[PDB]
Design a protein around this ligand. Structure first.
Ligand SMILES: CO[C@@H]1O[C@H](CO)[C@H](O)[C@H](O[C@]2(C(=O)O)C[C@H](O)[C@@H](NC(C)=O)[C@H]([C@H](O)[C@H](O)CO)O2)[C@H]1O
Ligand SMILES: [Ca+2]
Ligand code: NA
Length: 205
């Protein structure tokens, strides 16, 4: 319904142990939107049920003339904190709908089709925490023997990786094995690994 408010959302990827914040933009031909609900598909016209319960949202400047124009769309904040105990797999996404109402009571229609994703329909994808980070591997630590790093050398590699990766969670644990393999264990206990060849060299040859 192009006489109902129109919504532009996005690909709302979120990560265990991390806060998220996205904005959707809403316009209406009347220039005004009075109400915005984000909801699961189930329930019928009056439902506001939305899960997971940690998905929050808010819309400032509701119910004012000109609050929802093409040149200055209404914005809805979609935010929350993803718990560490969320299940993560290829199916750990949640398809949700943004419904907005204009002064005539026309509400954005919910159409159950993936071609509407990024409009009034959006997918909230929950990923493990390691997926938020792409550890930098540009550091180089020279060790005596690549097949047998000492404790000091293992700590040196971990410190080099940390120094190259100020953005990874401070409480993520960087450990290095006896052959220089790096494991980054995130707060949600997911891991990234860095092969030794990318962080360690020796002068044995
Ligand atoms: C009516 O059936 C639902 O229709 C919606 C679209 O309107 C979805 O297709 C939904 O399926 C999913 C989804 O929300 O995309 C498929 C996901 O794999 C499920 N996630 C998990 C972690 O199992 C969700 C989830 O079960 C649901 O969103 C709970 O509110 O459902 C259809 O079930
Ligand atoms: Ca309208
Ligand atoms: Na990663």
């Amino acid at each position: 319904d192009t006489e109902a408010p129109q919504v532009k959302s996005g690909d709302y990827v979120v990560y265990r142990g991390e806060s998220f914040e996205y904005y959707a933009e809403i316009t209406d031909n009347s220039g005004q939107v009075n109400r915005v609900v984000i909801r699961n598909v189930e329930g019928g016209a009056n439902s506001t049920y939305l899960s997971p319960n940690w998905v929050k949202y808010s819309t400032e400047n509701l119910g004012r003339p000109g609050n929802a124009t093409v040149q200055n769309p209404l914005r809805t904040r979609i935010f929350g904190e993803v718990p560490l105990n969320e299940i993560v797999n290829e199916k750990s996404y949640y398809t949700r709908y943004i419904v907005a109402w204009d002064p005539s009571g026309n509400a954005t229609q919910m159409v159950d089709n993936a071609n509407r994703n990024g409009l009034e329909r959006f997918v909230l994808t929950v990923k493990s925490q390691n997926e938020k980070y792409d550890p930098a591997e540009p550091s180089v630590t020279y060790v005596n023997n690549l097949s047998n790093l000492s404790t000091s050398e293992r700590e040196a590699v971990a410190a080099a990786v940390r120094a190259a990766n100020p953005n990874i969670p401070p409480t993520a644990k960087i450990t290095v094995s006896q052959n220089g393999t790096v494991t980054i264990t995130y707060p949600d206990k997911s891991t990234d690994t860095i092969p030794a060849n990318r962080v360690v060299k020796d002068l044995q040859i």
